[PDB]
Amino acid sequence: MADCRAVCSLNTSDRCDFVKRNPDCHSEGGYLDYLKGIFCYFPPNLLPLAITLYVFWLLYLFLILGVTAAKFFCPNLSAISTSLKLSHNVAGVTFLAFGNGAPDIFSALVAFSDPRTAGLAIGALFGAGVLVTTVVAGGITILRPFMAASRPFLRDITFYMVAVFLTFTALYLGRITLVWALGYLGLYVFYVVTVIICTWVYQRQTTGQILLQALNPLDYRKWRTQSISCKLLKVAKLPVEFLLLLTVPVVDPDKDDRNWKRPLNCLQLVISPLVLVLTLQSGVYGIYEIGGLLPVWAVVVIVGTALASVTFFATSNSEPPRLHWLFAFLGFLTSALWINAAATEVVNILRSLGVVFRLSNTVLGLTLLAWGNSIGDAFSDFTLARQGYPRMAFSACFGGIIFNILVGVGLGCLLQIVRSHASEVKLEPDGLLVWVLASALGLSLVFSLVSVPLQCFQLSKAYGLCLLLFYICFIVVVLLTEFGVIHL
Amino acid sequence: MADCRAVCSLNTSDRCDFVKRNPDCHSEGGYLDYLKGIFCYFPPNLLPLAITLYVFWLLYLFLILGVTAAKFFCPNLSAISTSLKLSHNVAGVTFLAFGNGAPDIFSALVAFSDPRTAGLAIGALFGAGVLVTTVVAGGITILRPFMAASRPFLRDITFYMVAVFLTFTALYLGRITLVWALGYLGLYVFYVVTVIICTWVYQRQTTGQILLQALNPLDYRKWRTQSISCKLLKVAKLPVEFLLLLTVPVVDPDKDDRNWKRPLNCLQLVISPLVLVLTLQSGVYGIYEIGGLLPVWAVVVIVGTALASVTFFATSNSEPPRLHWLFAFLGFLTSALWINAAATEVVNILRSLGVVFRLSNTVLGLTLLAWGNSIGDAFSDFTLARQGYPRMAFSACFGGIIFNILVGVGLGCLLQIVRSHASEVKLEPDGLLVWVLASALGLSLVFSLVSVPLQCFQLSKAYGLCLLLFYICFIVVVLLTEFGVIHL
Amino acid sequence: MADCRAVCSLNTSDRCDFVKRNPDCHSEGGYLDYLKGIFCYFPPNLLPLAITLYVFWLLYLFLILGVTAAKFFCPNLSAISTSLKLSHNVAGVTFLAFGNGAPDIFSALVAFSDPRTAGLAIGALFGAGVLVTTVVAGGITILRPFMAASRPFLRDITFYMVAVFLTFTALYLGRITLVWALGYLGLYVFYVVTVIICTWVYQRQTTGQILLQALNPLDYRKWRTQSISCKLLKVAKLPVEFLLLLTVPVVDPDKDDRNWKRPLNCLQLVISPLVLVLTLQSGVYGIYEIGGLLPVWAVVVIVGTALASVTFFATSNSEPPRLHWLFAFLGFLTSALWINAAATEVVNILRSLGVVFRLSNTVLGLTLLAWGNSIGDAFSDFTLARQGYPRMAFSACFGGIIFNILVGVGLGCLLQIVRSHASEVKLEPDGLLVWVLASALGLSLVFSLVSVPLQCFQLSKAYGLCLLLFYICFIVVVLLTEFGVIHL
Ligand SMILES: [Ca+2]
Ligand SMILES: [Ca+2]
Ligand SMILES: [Ca+2]
């Protein structure tokens, strides 16, 4: 079996045959075969343009990963928590971190699902830790100087340092066991409990019109008021939320009617199970045929329409049903699944590029995937800082990364152990570069660990500028390392 | 052919003969020779004494560049900017850019004269670009904080990035054809036209006693009150001040009199064109005879005295001429030349003393030459920033260099193509240093483009300090590469 | 001679005897043999406990250095500066310089005693210079912005650059002769004379109750109003404060009584020479017997008792004697030792821990030596900056390092020539690390010499942040070189 990477070394007349014949050049998950499109569907003379197109497509995927994370997933989780009566301070501390880090967890899980992309997963995590800590955080200090809380900052930086050192020693060991993932999850739950306890101690011391309006994502007044760039962003974004409202239910506890749309939701009780079945595991469960006569999707649709009719005739348009909260549960699950699908696509695209340009997995993980996953963090944090809440944004800038690393690594490793029935996940370090990446992350923390206390916790513009220059130097070192300029 | 450095290894009796017989030991800068003075006129026992005189001489040039920029160049540029109602951005983009780039265009053209020198032609350009965009910009920001104009800054940086990318692609391809040269020229013309159009759109939206007192640069009352050191400094500055006042007109718009000094101005109307003629390219045109009967300087004198007589008959003593502002242009142009020669002499100092020192070739064709080319830009920009025009200097910091890159590459390649009768000019990459320079320039541009908008266009001192640190890192990288300790 | 690290691989029975006979396992300058304690006094099963106990001891040491500098060293230095009417620059250049530089010189002499360690000594000197000139200066500027004096700063930086370049060329030649050492000493003498002359030119242009109250470190009024945790902190600080009060006299010009406690000062007049003699070279001079009949300690006790009795009978309790400021000198000198010894202990702990963790000596030999050797400076400079004298500490950050380099190198070389009866001392360059350290020192000096004057001598936080980033880059380069990432 010849390796996929040799494809660029063969004649153009045999590229299609080699791609079609090599099991390695086939991806186990996804809807599109990108390598086939690169080497068979398009002529070789148009090879560069196609790659550019892919990049554009890749960017669009990340946009989806933003919207589903911000407008449907996070509000559904917030409604679920409000059903459990959680405090506002805990919400401000955590929910933004969950909303910003869900794409990171799903991308890491998809990457760890296959050994060949395993090196991508770590490259997705540490690189993000290098970015959000250096650029985004620094950006906040540039936009609005403020005074940072001492004790929460020290706690967050200590927990992040502990997590980073644990992952460093795990990488040095070259393997991840089941007990290690369980310890990661236990450490995260310990951190959450510690945050709760410390906060407590500190505090103590016609139907057609409603469907047309609900399915309309264009607020005409706001769209008219916005500038040209915002108009372009909104028009580019319209199909994504159109599909999302169409398929994903959202429950908002802040609304007196709880976003009750009786016929829209009655249609959704049929739509959501169908998309769930047809999308789970790339639809493999969808075409499974029961007893050799009836496919699953047909009986799923029948049960869904029966339930929708029962609910529609059993409820009224004025008063939401007593079981309205269960909708959010559905509005949770499918939403997460949607993100998963998008995540898978992104990973596949990156792998394809690794075949074409003969690039290492770590370089792709720390450059493209990190930026794509952190664009949502950057937008949310900059918006929060500009609106007059820099303390919350800066606190989240360190709170979310710990949750990202711990939950992503632990859950991905746990699911890989459970699914493959293997006792261990093998981490193969892709040469020297990975070590450099880890080193960079640690150094950044050290800078903060010295810079913030030395300023008496009054963060200024120079701190952000220095962090930005540090990130530029880090990218300089990475670029030198990749192209083989420095080599043992 | 023996290297000129071998002068040091030869016997003291044969050094002068070797210098005389070897054309390579002749000054590339030209004008006053220095090596002949060191090795022929001065005995070796007097050579250490001789050495003291040149260092002192060197410092004197740094005084001249200090005076000409302080009293003649910058006030004339300010008068030109005020007279035409130009904004600071456009004036820095065109006039200060031409004045700063004349030595660089000349050096780039003469270097691009041959196929072997072609690799080096690009490296000096990139080094000068990096130095100007980093150190001069940082100094301007540190000395005087200011608010930059968003749209002109974005336009300038975008055009600079496009030009740098085009030059990088040209280097990667390894050849420059006719189409590339005409494309460079057309791009520069398009940039100038776009600047003009945007500016217009924004806008729409006894006599002998007088001569004697004018020719005196010394004020007796202030001289008496000055300290002994200050008196000595004034005495040292007196000769160059007198010569500049005799040679270079200055028009100060804010004073009502606008420096209208009639007899001195009539004298300048005839001496300044003579200075231009006998200074351009070391007087080659000055020695030229038209048909062997009338020399060029004679015709220049005739035209100058005709104009002087016309002004004498058509102008009065106490009322300014309505076309006085045009005189400023002349005072600008000569002043630029008064800079260039001085700068050249500085180089002719460093290069000469170095042969006795035995400085390495690899480091010089890249450090001394770029610094010598950009010393005029540094002096002019710092003097302008100190006086209270930071915006013009900051805009010129990009305008001069975009002009330099575009017009230098295009005009030099086109002239070489025409003279050599070739279809293309081959480009050789002389090691990793050119690629390092290009990467450094690109990364500096990226850092500026990210940092400046993030600061809400308020350029503080932290930005300048970070730029200085970035230049230190760049010099670290280039010094590491030159020694070969970082091998490909 | 087996490595001391092999103590880990041996059986628990013979580890103590291995520590006993192996000379490399014993520390020459410490009071306590930590390795002997861990491997002999404590059973192996309690080995982790000892480690954590040492950690606690380490922390307690950081408390002593916290108190001695805060209450005894800095007030005495301020009293000396005020009494002699010395400007902050001069006092920081001289007195704080010797106080911070004594342990360097001692370590440099010890290292230069063995010719094989000459390169290690010069590398340690360069590393200490880099650390003090970068990190200490940055922290000093961040903690308290100030306006530095122009002429003293320029003079100090020029002298330091000259010294660094002279050491560089001496290292490049590979030998240091007697003439070089005499030149170093003469240069230091010239520097001191120049400082003094320039300063002159500028200037011209019952007893029992009082003993109990004085020796009581507890203020009951502040004792009652304080919190439980700070009560524990005060209880912990009580013994060292009592010992320091008994040993170190304090003169405070800001108090009406000038901190005059006649019986306590009379007793200190006896105690201070006693403790000085008993700590100098661990009491070797104390055990010395003059002619085999009278020991030195008895003689100094008799002299101190006579002087104390004379002073007691010659002064009253109400008024302090005119020579009271002389006491400050004593209160200065002893305090310095009480810092130095403490610093030594910290090192003798860390090295021991390095034996347990098998840390590679590669990094420790130059870097770890510098941090333990400079910790006293760092403490003194930060404490002085916090109390309101940033200029003195900032000037010390250059004057003291000049003192270290010049005097250490000159005295070590001169002593080696005199002792060994040779004519030169041969310096072997041990790899690229020494060159990297020297180049980093030169680059930091150049960056400071460029940035500070451009800043108009107004030192703000951006300068310190940039210096810290520079140090992080320097440690990055050092780590890259030591690991063999870059091959020559
Ligand atoms: Ca993210
Ligand atoms: Ca120039
Ligand atoms: Ca020291």
- Is the CB of residue B101 less than 8 Å away from at least one CB of chain C? no
Interatomic CA distance for residues A266 and C352, integer angstroms: 73
- The SS3 call for residue B290 is strand
Q: Is C147 within a domain?
A: yes
**CA of B469 to nearest chain C CA: how many angstroms apart?**
7
Give the number of other Cβ atoms within 10 Å of residue C148's Cβ.
17
Chain position carrying tokens 């860390």: C350
Neighbours of chain C (3+ CB pairs under 8 A): A, B
Helix axes A47-67, A88-112, angle to 10 degrees: 150
Can you read off the two tokens belonging to residue B361? Answer: 């070739």
Pair A164, A442: CB distance under 8 Å: yes
Pair A66, A380: CB distance under 8 Å: no
Alpha helices, DSSP H only, in A206-282?
207-214, 220-225, 228-247, 262-279
| B66, B111: one domain | yes
Pair B422, B178: CB distance under 8 Å: no
Q: Which of A432, A451, A487 sits opposite C465 (nearest CB)?
A: A451
Handedness of CA B25, B29, B33, B35 (dihedral sign): negative
Residue B191 CA to ligand 2 center (angstroms) comes to 19
Q: Which of C432, C460, C473 sits opposite B461 (nearest CB)?
A: C460
CA–CA distances in Å: residue A364 to residues A273, A368, A412, B434, B439: 35, 6, 19, 26, 20
CA–CA distances in Å: residue C283 to residues B462, C276, C295: 53, 9, 12
Question: Which letter, b or e, does each residue of B276-287 get, where b requires 16 or more Cβ atoms within 10 Å of its Cβ?
Answer: bbbbeeeeebbe
The distance of Cα B69 from the centroid of its chain, to the nearest Å, equals 11
Interface test with B, best of A143, A371, A471, A472 (most B CBs within 10 A): A472
Experimental method reported for this structure: cryo-EM
Cβ contact, residue pair C469, A465, below 8 Å = no
Residue C162 CA to ligand 3 center (angstroms) comes to 20
Q: Is A347 within a domain?
A: yes
Can you read off the two tokens belonging to residue B315? Answer: 């102008």
DSSP string for B6-55:
HHHHS-HHHHHHHHHH-GGGS-SS-SS-SHHIIIIIS-TTTHHHHHHHHH
Domain interval for residue B168: 49-205+324-482
Interatomic CA distance for residues C131 and C400, integer angstroms: 13
**CA of B444 to nearest chain A CA: how many angstroms apart?**
9
Please return the burial class of B16, using the count of CB atoms within 10 Å of its CB with bins 0-12, 13-18 and 19+: middle
Please report how many Cα atoms fall inside a 13 Å half-sphere around the Cα of residue C368, on the Cβ side.
17
Can you read off the two tokens belonging to residue A281? Answer: 């595991």
**Which contiguous run of DSSP H or E holds residue B188?**
helix B178-204
Q: Which of C443, C454, C465 sits opposite B472 (nearest CB)?
A: C443
- Is the CB of residue C451 less than 8 Å away from at least one CB of chain B? yes
- The SS3 call for residue A7 is helix
| B347, B440: one domain | yes
Interatomic CA distance for residues A159 and A137, integer angstroms: 17
Rg (CA), chain A: 24
Interatomic CA distance for residues B389 and B381, integer angstroms: 9
Handedness of CA A119, A120, A121, A123 (dihedral sign): positive
**CA of B283 to nearest chain A CA: how many angstroms apart?**
48
| B361, B463: one domain | yes
Q: Is C72 within a domain?
A: no
- Is the CB of residue A445 less than 8 Å away from at least one CB of chain C? no
Residue B377 CA to ligand 2 center (angstroms) comes to 5
Interatomic CA distance for residues B195 and B93, integer angstroms: 9
Pair B140, B382: CB distance under 8 Å: yes
How much helix, strand and coil, in percent to the nearest 5, is found in chain B? Answer: 75, 5, 20
Nearest Cα neighbor of A346 from A377, A321, A369 is A369
Interatomic CA distance for residues C425 and C412, integer angstroms: 10
- Is the CB of residue C488 less than 8 Å away from at least one CB of chain A? no
Q: Which of B443, B456, B488 sits opposite A472 (nearest CB)?
A: B443
Chain position carrying tokens 């040095």: A172
Interface test with B, best of C130, C169, C446, C450 (most B CBs within 10 A): C450
Interatomic CA distance for residues A302 and B148, integer angstroms: 65
Cβ contact, residue pair B476, C451, below 8 Å = no
Q: Looking at the DSSP assignment, which residues form a beta bridge with residue C177?
A: C424
CA–CA distances in Å: residue A59 to residues A73, A88, A350, A369, C38: 20, 34, 12, 10, 60
Which contacts (CB < 8 Å, 24+ apart) does range C24-31 have?
Answer: C25/C355, C27/C348, C27/C351, C29/C344, C29/C348, C30/C344, C30/C345, C30/C348, C31/C282, C31/C341, C31/C345
Pair A7, A25: CB distance under 8 Å: yes
Largest Cα–Cα separation, chain B = 76
How much helix, strand and coil, in percent to the nearest 5, is found in chain A? Answer: 80, 5, 20
Pair B74, B99: CB distance under 8 Å: no
Cβ contact, residue pair A451, C468, below 8 Å = yes
Cβ contact, residue pair C466, B466, below 8 Å = yes
- Per the structure, how many domains does chain A have? 1
| B75, B88: one domain | yes
Neighbours of chain B (3+ CB pairs under 8 A): A, C
Residue C343 CA to ligand 3 center (angstroms) comes to 10
Interatomic CA distance for residues B23 and B18, integer angstroms: 9
Residue A377 CA to ligand 1 center (angstroms) comes to 5
Interatomic CA distance for residues B258 and B252, integer angstroms: 5
**Which contiguous run of DSSP H or E holds residue A399?**
helix A390-420
- The SS3 call for residue A112 is helix
Phi/psi at B291 (nearest 5 deg)? Answer: 70, 10
Can you read off the two tokens belonging to residue C302? Answer: 């008799």
Phi/psi at C294 (nearest 5 deg)? Answer: -125, 120
Interatomic CA distance for residues A119 and C160, integer angstroms: 49
Residue B283 Ramachandran class (φ > 0 left, ψ -120 to 50 alpha, else beta): left
Interface test with A, best of B466, B469, B470 (most A CBs within 10 A): B466
Contact residues, chain B, for C487 at CB < 8 Å: 487
| B53, B177: one domain | yes
Q: Which of A447, A486, A488 sits opposite C468 (nearest CB)?
A: A447
CA–CA distances in Å: residue A314 to residues A265, A266, A320, C6, C133: 13, 11, 11, 81, 79
Contact residues, chain A, for C479 at CB < 8 Å: 439
The distance of Cα B416 from the centroid of its chain, to the nearest Å, equals 23
Neighbours of chain A (3+ CB pairs under 8 A): B, C
Task: Collect all residues with Cβ–Cβ distance below 8 Å to A212 and sequence separation of at least 6.
Answer: none
Cβ contact, residue pair C465, B462, below 8 Å = yes
Interface test with B, best of C169, C451, C474, C482 (most B CBs within 10 A): C451
Interatomic CA distance for residues A77 and C469, integer angstroms: 41
Q: Is C229 within a domain?
A: no
Q: Which of C465, C476, C479 sits opposite A463 (nearest CB)?
A: C465
Pair A163, A400: CB distance under 8 Å: no
A66 alpha carbon, closest ligand: 1
3-state secondary structure C33-47: CHHHHHHHHCCHHHH
CA–CA distances in Å: residue B286 to residues A273, B150, B300, B302: 92, 47, 10, 14
Q: Is B352 within a domain?
A: yes
Q: Looking at the DSSP assignment, which residues form a beta bridge with residue B177?
A: B424
Indicate which CATH number applies to the domain containing C89.
Answer: 1.20.1420.30
- The SS3 call for residue A276 is helix
**CA of A127 to nearest chain C CA: how many angstroms apart?**
18
Interatomic CA distance for residues A245 and A247, integer angstroms: 6
**Which contiguous run of DSSP H or E holds residue C438?**
helix C433-454
Q: Is C34 within a domain?
A: no
Cβ contact, residue pair B451, A465, below 8 Å = yes
Interatomic CA distance for residues B342 and B466, integer angstroms: 31
* A364, amino acid identity: L
Find, in chain A, the residue whose alpha carbon is nearest to that of C483. Answer: A488
Contact residues, chain A, for B462 at CB < 8 Å: 461-462, 465
Pairing mode, if any, of strands C289-290 and B294-295? unpaired
Interatomic CA distance for residues A289 and A280, integer angstroms: 16
* A129, amino acid identity: G
DSSP string for C301-321:
HHHHHHHHHHHHHH--SSS--
Rg (CA), chain B: 24
Interatomic CA distance for residues B276 and A469, integer angstroms: 46
DSSP string for C87-154:
-HHHHHHHHHHHHHHHHHHHHHHHHHHSGGGHHHHHHHHHHHHHHIIIIIHHHHHHHS-EE--HHHHH
Which contacts (CB < 8 Å, 24+ apart) does range C112-115 have?
Answer: C112/C412, C112/C413, C112/C415, C112/C416, C112/C425, C113/C412, C113/C415, C113/C416, C115/C416, C115/C425, C115/C426
- Is the CB of residue B479 less than 8 Å away from at least one CB of chain C? yes
Can you read off the two tokens belonging to residue A479? Answer: 């670029």
Can you read off the two tokens belonging to residue B343? Answer: 């700068």
Cβ contact, residue pair B454, A143, below 8 Å = yes
Nearest Cα neighbor of C191 from C488, C402, C370, C482 is C402
Find, in chain B, the residue whose alpha carbon is nearest to that of C451. Answer: B465
**Which contiguous run of DSSP H or E holds residue C220?**
helix C220-224
Q: Looking at the DSSP assignment, which residues form a beta bridge with residue A177?
A: A424
Q: Is B241 within a domain?
A: no
Q: Which of A443, A454, A473 sits opposite C139 (nearest CB)?
A: A454
Residue A103 CA to ligand 1 center (angstroms) comes to 6
- What DSSP designation does A158 have? H
- Is the CB of residue C357 less than 8 Å away from at least one CB of chain A? no
DSSP string for B307-363:
HHHHHHHH--SSS--TTHHHHHHHHHHHHHHHHHHHHHHHHHHHHHHHHHHT--HHH
First to last CA, chain B: 32
Nearest Cα neighbor of B362 from B484, B476, B470, B487 is B484
3-state secondary structure A471-482: HHHHHHHHHHHH
Q: Is A357 within a domain?
A: yes
Contact residues, chain B, for A381 at CB < 8 Å: none
